[PDB]
Amino acid sequence: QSKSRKIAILGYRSVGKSSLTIQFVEGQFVDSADPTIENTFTKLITVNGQEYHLQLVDTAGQDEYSIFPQTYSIDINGYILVYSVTSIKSFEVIKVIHGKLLDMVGKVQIPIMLVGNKKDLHMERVISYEEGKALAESWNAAFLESSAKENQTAVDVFRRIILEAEK
Template sequence: MAPKQRKIALMGFRSVGKSSITIQLVEGQFVDSYDPTIENTFYTTIKVKGQDYSLKLVDTAGQDEYSIFPHSYAMDIHGYCLVYSINNAKSFEVVRIIYDKLLDMTGKIHVPIILVGNKVDLHLERCVSYQEGKDLANYMKAQFVEVSAKENMAVNSMFQTLILNIEKQSLAESPENTQEKHNKCIVS
């Protein structure tokens, strides 16, 4: 069975660990040095429920509340990882703003999203509670996970969860299911 192609964008405030999460998945290592990302694209293959997925990961530049949402981030993207750092309240605020801009750009009611609280290894510096993350994910109708790119905790499962969400969404939007809905319409 040929791998399914999926394109995922990682978005969030600067220095929340988008690149660290991506490099941890692709290369299996944590990069300690930090160069602000302009935009990088990474490729990897991941297996979910026996199906191979060829992933194109768009590691975006850090956004803030004033960033203009690039139109390219709304085109041909199958799913989004919205990342904040559990020890940075500003990054948590910005991720909600990114979500609102994302909905404005895509015009979709439901976009496959996973909200990611990174840096759980810094739990002593935590200023965004697990419950706050869970509540925001519920507002977004998104999956939610806390990870540590540094300790490679839950990074792989985070992407698997998003892929399952993408597959569920694409199944719901498939022509067969859309046709069934149309067949049930009654015009009087």
């Protein structure tokens, strides 16, 4: 009766993959997490009356030199690509990640969204909302900005990838 979804969170180091996931899962903002270990969390959520059992795969990051498998995992239902609005490197990297991701998954109908994180650090922003939104638009992807300090923004991220999966 409950639907099962596996979601992978990708992105450069320090963009907030872990903090976002932990905010969503446990409702806490954390100041650090093992940068080099992949963590899998589970979380039960109800979206629009529908019960979902989530496995959230919080990858250790990737950069421009990271290897992507050459073929996809049928058991992964969506990809969240995170960058930080405070890091141009992160934003450039997320484009390379998207490229290698698309090469791995090809035409498969598995949703990919883009998330500009750390929006609370408004004095440290180097990526405009427009830049992120337009990139996502050029990918035919959903876009959101988020802050791991703000529970609703993290919830909105994971809910949106779930909604995108069933379009």
